[PDB]
Design an enzyme around this catalytic site. Structure first.
Site, PDB file in Angstrom:
ATOM      1  N   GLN A 105      36.527  46.862  30.150  1.00 51.80           N
ATOM      2  CA  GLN A 105      36.920  46.801  31.547  1.00 51.80           C
ATOM      3  C   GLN A 105      35.927  47.537  32.460  1.00 51.80           C
ATOM      4  O   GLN A 105      35.705  47.125  33.597  1.00 51.80           O
ATOM      5  CB  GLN A 105      38.337  47.365  31.727  1.00 51.80           C
ATOM      6  N   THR A 184      26.558  44.599  42.006  1.00 56.07           N
ATOM      7  CA  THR A 184      25.247  44.293  41.440  1.00 56.07           C
ATOM      8  C   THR A 184      25.310  43.763  39.992  1.00 56.07           C
ATOM      9  O   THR A 184      26.090  44.239  39.172  1.00 56.07           O
ATOM     10  CB  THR A 184      24.325  45.542  41.533  1.00 56.07           C
TER      11      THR A 184
HETATM   12  C1  HEM Z   1      45.362  47.279  31.745  1.00 58.03           C
HETATM   13  C2  HEM Z   1      44.098  46.769  31.921  1.00 58.03           C
HETATM   14  C3  HEM Z   1      43.782  45.582  32.907  1.00 58.03           C
HETATM   15  C4  HEM Z   1      44.464  45.173  34.000  1.00 58.03           C
HETATM   16  C5  HEM Z   1      45.772  45.759  34.537  1.00 58.03           C
HETATM   17  C6  HEM Z   1      43.738  44.031  34.493  1.00 58.03           C
HETATM   18  C7  HEM Z   1      44.062  43.296  35.614  1.00 58.03           C
HETATM   19  C8  HEM Z   1      43.237  42.383  36.277  1.00 58.03           C
HETATM   20  C9  HEM Z   1      43.518  41.643  37.507  1.00 58.03           C
HETATM   21  C10 HEM Z   1      44.794  41.730  38.348  1.00 58.03           C
HETATM   22  C11 HEM Z   1      42.453  40.890  37.770  1.00 58.03           C
HETATM   23  C12 HEM Z   1      42.181  39.900  38.940  1.00 58.03           C
HETATM   24  C13 HEM Z   1      42.482  38.455  38.605  1.00 58.03           C
HETATM   25  C14 HEM Z   1      42.027  37.474  39.668  1.00 58.03           C
HETATM   26  O1  HEM Z   1      42.485  37.553  40.874  1.00 58.03           O
HETATM   27  O2  HEM Z   1      41.191  36.594  39.267  1.00 58.03           O
HETATM   28  C15 HEM Z   1      41.493  41.189  36.663  1.00 58.03           C
HETATM   29  C16 HEM Z   1      40.287  40.669  36.541  1.00 58.03           C
HETATM   30  C17 HEM Z   1      39.399  40.779  35.520  1.00 58.03           C
HETATM   31  N1  HEM Z   1      39.580  41.446  34.366  1.00 58.03           N
HETATM   32 FE1  HEM Z   1      40.929  42.751  34.251  1.00 58.03          FE
HETATM   33  N2  HEM Z   1      42.607  43.834  33.774  1.00 58.03           N
HETATM   34  C18 HEM Z   1      42.636  44.737  32.775  1.00 58.03           C
HETATM   35  C19 HEM Z   1      41.748  44.846  31.782  1.00 58.03           C
HETATM   36  C20 HEM Z   1      40.589  44.169  31.554  1.00 58.03           C
HETATM   37  C21 HEM Z   1      39.700  44.313  30.368  1.00 58.03           C
HETATM   38  C22 HEM Z   1      39.897  45.262  29.120  1.00 58.03           C
HETATM   39  C23 HEM Z   1      38.672  43.428  30.540  1.00 58.03           C
HETATM   40  C24 HEM Z   1      37.404  43.107  29.644  1.00 58.03           C
HETATM   41  C25 HEM Z   1      37.004  43.711  28.518  1.00 58.03           C
HETATM   42  C26 HEM Z   1      38.950  42.789  31.801  1.00 58.03           C
HETATM   43  C27 HEM Z   1      38.168  41.838  32.366  1.00 58.03           C
HETATM   44  C28 HEM Z   1      38.437  41.296  33.620  1.00 58.03           C
HETATM   45  C29 HEM Z   1      37.449  40.584  34.271  1.00 58.03           C
HETATM   46  C30 HEM Z   1      36.043  40.197  33.864  1.00 58.03           C
HETATM   47  C31 HEM Z   1      38.084  40.156  35.582  1.00 58.03           C
HETATM   48  C32 HEM Z   1      37.258  39.275  36.637  1.00 58.03           C
HETATM   49  C33 HEM Z   1      36.394  40.221  37.634  1.00 58.03           C
HETATM   50  C34 HEM Z   1      35.797  39.541  38.853  1.00 58.03           C
HETATM   51  O3  HEM Z   1      36.554  39.154  39.793  1.00 58.03           O
HETATM   52  O4  HEM Z   1      34.571  39.380  38.868  1.00 58.03           O
HETATM   53  N3  HEM Z   1      40.111  43.232  32.399  1.00 58.03           N
HETATM   54  N4  HEM Z   1      41.999  42.076  35.803  1.00 58.03           N
HETATM   55  N1  LIG Z   2      46.076  44.385  40.660  1.00 54.31           N
HETATM   56  N2  LIG Z   2      44.702  44.396  41.049  1.00 54.31           N
HETATM   57  C1  LIG Z   2      43.442  44.855  41.158  1.00 54.31           C
HETATM   58  O1  LIG Z   2      43.029  45.399  42.186  1.00 54.31           O
HETATM   59  C2  LIG Z   2      42.470  44.719  40.005  1.00 54.31           C
HETATM   60  C3  LIG Z   2      42.373  45.643  38.947  1.00 54.31           C
HETATM   61  C4  LIG Z   2      41.430  45.408  37.932  1.00 54.31           C
HETATM   62  N3  LIG Z   2      40.603  44.336  37.909  1.00 54.31           N
HETATM   63  C5  LIG Z   2      40.713  43.464  38.930  1.00 54.31           C
HETATM   64  C6  LIG Z   2      41.617  43.601  39.994  1.00 54.31           C
HETATM   65 CA   LIG Z   3      26.060  46.795  38.496  1.00 57.78          CA
END
Ligand code: HEM
Ligand SMILES: N=NC(=O)c1ccncc1
Ligand SMILES: [Ca+2]
Ligand SMILES: *[C@@H]1O[C@H](CO)[C@@H](O[C@@H]2O[C@H](CO)[C@@H](O[C@H]3O[C@H](CO)[C@@H](O)[C@H](O)[C@@H]3O)[C@H](O)[C@H]2NC(C)=O)[C@H](O)[C@H]1NC(C)=O
Ligand SMILES: *[C@@H]1O[C@H](CO)[C@@H](O[C@@H]2O[C@H](CO)[C@@H](O[C@H]3O[C@H](CO)[C@@H](O)[C@H](O)[C@@H]3O)[C@H](O)[C@H]2NC(C)=O)[C@H](O)[C@H]1NC(C)=O
Ligand SMILES: *[C@@H]1O[C@H](CO)[C@@H](O[C@@H]2O[C@H](CO)[C@@H](O)[C@H](O)[C@H]2NC(C)=O)[C@H](O)[C@H]1NC(C)=O
Ligand SMILES: *[C@@H]1O[C@H](CO)[C@@H](O[C@@H]2O[C@H](CO)[C@@H](O)[C@H](O)[C@H]2NC(C)=O)[C@H](O)[C@H]1NC(C)=O
Length: 595
Positions: A105, A184
């Protein structure tokens, strides 16, 4: 075809070319083409966008319009039928600490962010969407299918807003729709320092001329620092407990406070910067404040890349690592370091690794208190537990001593995320991360699963029988077929994650290829890759391969027993050693003498 023009969002700067430090916006990395890899530019498109109207209308937007002949199934229906499960027993990854998931993350957040569209503060569209679910403009809601239990309880849909897009933001026209990357592309620790000169500055302590990052003044963690609180009200962190009134943290990246564990890791890094700076001040009394900021910054970046490439990636890719990321031969200025639009969905495999609960442990790694194990959903935007309930030490021990969740074809995403996700904007703990991920695949106009299998030179199944063979699962292949009618239509997010894992890795053939290429590219195209001759000194590099996340813990908490390999599963006490048995980063090679 060929634009190279369109680009209202700059903001442009002049390049120094002899500056030994990275810009904050990512600009000037590449000398020939100075904006390559900068914050606030379109994500790169490895393949032509595939939108319903060929331009910007997402699939499933217009009811009457199919995709390859069939109707795409609702994000939530797919979520309900394929992605969810009830039994958390036997779900944990036997050889991956909780840290494995949390580092992913961090990395992902250093590399990409496609924020949602605004055009609304003092707005009714924020509400004409939440309250009545009318699809239109940027509101593109997630409708509940019949027999979904959230109907009787939540409403008729979950509000969802389309991602921001380049040039304007407004109504708009013209070429194909390209989403923005607000950060970035280079693995440069942009999540600690910020991606805009505006934010990067607020984050700093320019009162002291010692080059430190600004720390919190209302609270401490045993004399150790905490991130500053964020100015903005309404803050979601004080909403989840109107009583304790604790705001979110102000950090390099805006998603820092999303969940207690991510906030924790952010704190470790903030602390390492300051520690690194007071140390440099001690051997180069004469260096100025910016000198301390930049050089500390430079070290931390190098650190994030080493852990990531030396420690983390090889256990994500497994046997497929060497095949996409051969060893480093030097900087290659012909490599596009930009994060592709698809990488932001492939990297979301991390979502299937999030376990249902979080723990705090005491000095002997024992349950700390009576309510030591909390359901993950009580921690979204939860800052008060850190400040008002023990600091980060109890949480950092949990990171080292607990396990990640193991992706599992029959048990993909925990209900803590598939049903109880809290959005910083709305009021309920009732969103579905899975459905959002799928709805966003379409928002971004991603090509189908088979488009991506061809890209990576993998077979493309056209039949049920074909897909059972690739997924090595009859039940799953079937469920999927019934919903999507054709493998051409399977959304890549679920397509990629459904594939069984590769040897010694944690993702499958398709994802390995997508992830592998991206990282190879951000390394080979990064003029400031730590190993790039001239960026650091031989003696400096020698000192840097001795860094380890374990050490980071020792130097910045009061934890004394840590594992030597923090990412694999470690048991207490057999696997834990004393912090003094651990390789320290020797800063002696950064000393500078006058004459
Ligand atoms: C408890 C942990 C996490 C929470 C609560 C969480 C929650 C979220 C939420 C709400 C989004 C936005 C979705 C959208 O509107 O498209 C997101 C995006 C994302 N999550 Fe997480 N996530 C978690 C962990 C992780 C982990 C462990 C990874 C990868 C190893 C990860 C990778 C991503 C990526 C790549 C995005 C897209 C970022 C962008 O907009 O460029 N997430 N996550
Ligand atoms: N619940 N939303 C967030 O702001 C968020 C948290 C982690 N990754 C993407 C979005
Ligand atoms: Ca960067
Ligand atoms: C649990 O996960 C561990 C990592 O995923 C795994 O062990 C790792 O296996 C690698 C294989 O490349 C070893 O790496 C080093 O091996 C030789 C010594 O045998 C060294 O000379 C080389 O430097 C090479 O890099 C490691 O021993 C280990 N990785 C690390 C550093 O932790 C475990 O076996 C897994 N547990 C089980 C039983 O599945
Ligand atoms: C909202 O935040 C509150 C704290 O900011 C939290 O309550 C706090 O936690 C417990 C109450 O359950 C108390 O902690 C312990 O205090 C002493 C030991 O120091 C014991 O005698 C108590 O029995 C208890 O175990 C805190 O006193 C309390 N803090 C305050 C000021 O109330 C609430 O639980 C949070 N509410 C929600 C909705 O999460
Ligand atoms: C910016 O740096 C200054 C100088 O280091 C900080 O002032 C110190 O604050 C600590 C913690 O409150 C105390 O030990 C001293 O009173 C100060 N020491 C010095 C060297 O003057 C200041 O707190 C920092 N400000 C922010 C926002 O981080
Ligand atoms: C830098 O990267 C480029 C592009 O990724 C590489 O260029 C390849 O050059 C070969 C000739 O040796 C051509 O057959 C290919 O068309 C190019 N490959 C691709 C996929 O673009 C090159 O390997 C790298 N440059 C050096 C010398 O390291």
């Amino acid at each position: 075809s060929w634009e190279v023009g369109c680009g209202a969002p700059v903001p442009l700067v002049k390049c120094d070319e002899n500056s030994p430090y990275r810009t904050i916006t990512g600009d000037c990395n590449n000398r020939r083409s100075p904006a390559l890899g900068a914050a606030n530019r379109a994500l790169a498109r490895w393949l032509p966008a595939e939108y319903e109207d060929g331009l910007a209308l997402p699939f499933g937007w217009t009811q009457r319009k199919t995709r390859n002949g069939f109707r795409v199934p609702l994000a939530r229906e797919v979520s309900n039928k394929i992605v969810g499960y009830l039994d958390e027993e036997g779900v944990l990854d036997q050889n991956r600490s909780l840290l494995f998931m949390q580092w992913g993350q961090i990395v992902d957040h250093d590399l990409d962010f496609a924020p949602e569209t605004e055009l609304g503060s003092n707005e009714h569209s924020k509400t004409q969407c939440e309250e009545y679910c009318i699809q239109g403009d940027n509101c593109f809601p997630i409708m509940f299918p019949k027999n979904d239990p959230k109907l009787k309880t939540q409403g008729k849909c979950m509000p969802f807003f389309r991602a921001g897009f380049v040039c304007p933001t407004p109504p708009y026209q013209s070429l194909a729709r390209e989403q923005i990357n607000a950060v970035t592309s280079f693995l440069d620790a942009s999540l600690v320092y910020g991606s805009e000169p505006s934010l990067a500055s607020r984050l700093r302590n320019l009162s002291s001329p010692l080059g430190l990052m600004a720390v919190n003044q209302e609270a401490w963690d045993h004399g150790l620092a905490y991130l500053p609180f964020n100015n903005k009200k309404p803050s979601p962190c004080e909403f989840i407990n109107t009583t304790a009134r604790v705001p979110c943290f102000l950090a390099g990246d805006f998603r820092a406070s999303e969940q207690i564990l991510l906030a924790t890791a952010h704190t470790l890094l903030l602390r390492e910067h300051n520690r690194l700076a007071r140390e440099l001040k001690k051997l180069n009394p004469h260096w100025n404040g910016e000198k301390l900021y930049q050089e500390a910054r430079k070290i931390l970046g190098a650190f994030i890349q080493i852990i990531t490439f030396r420690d983390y990636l090889p256990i994500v890719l497994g046997s497929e690592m060497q095949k996409w990321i051969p060893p480093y031969q030097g900087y290659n200025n012909s490599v596009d370091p930009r994060i592709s639009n698809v990488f932001t969905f492939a990297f979301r495999f991390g979502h299937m690794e999030v376990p249902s609960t979080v723990s705090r442990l005491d000095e002997n790694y024992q349950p700390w208190g009576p309510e030591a194990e909390l359901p993950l959903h009580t921690l979204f935007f939860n800052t008060w537990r850190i400040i008002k309930d023990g600091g980060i030490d109890p949480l950092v021990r949990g990171l080292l001593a607990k396990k990640s969740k193991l992706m599992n074809q029959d048990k993909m995403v925990t209900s803590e995320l598939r049903n109880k996700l809290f959005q910083p904007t709305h009021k309920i703990h009732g969103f579905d991360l899975a459905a959002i991920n799928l709805q966003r695949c379409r928002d971004h106009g991603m090509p189908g699963y088979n488009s991506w299998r061809g890209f990576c030179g993998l077979s493309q199944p056209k039949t049920l029988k074909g897909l059972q063979t690739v997924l090595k699962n009859k039940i799953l292949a079937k469920k999927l077929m019934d919903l999507y009618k054709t493998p051409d239509n399977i959304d890549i997010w679920i397509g990629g994650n459904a594939e069984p894992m590769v040897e010694r890795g944690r993702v499958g053939p398709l994802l390995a290829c997508l992830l592998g290429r991206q990282f190879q590219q951000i390394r080979d195209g990064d003029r400031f890759w730590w190993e790039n001759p001239g960026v650091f000194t031989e003696k400096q590099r020698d000192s840097l391969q001795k860094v380890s996340f374990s050490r980071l813990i020792c130097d910045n908490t009061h934890i004394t027993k840590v594992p030597l390999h923090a990412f694999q599963a470690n048991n207490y006490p057999h696997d834990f050693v004393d912090c003094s048995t651990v390789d320290k980063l020797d800063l002696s090679p950064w000393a500078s003498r006058e004459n």
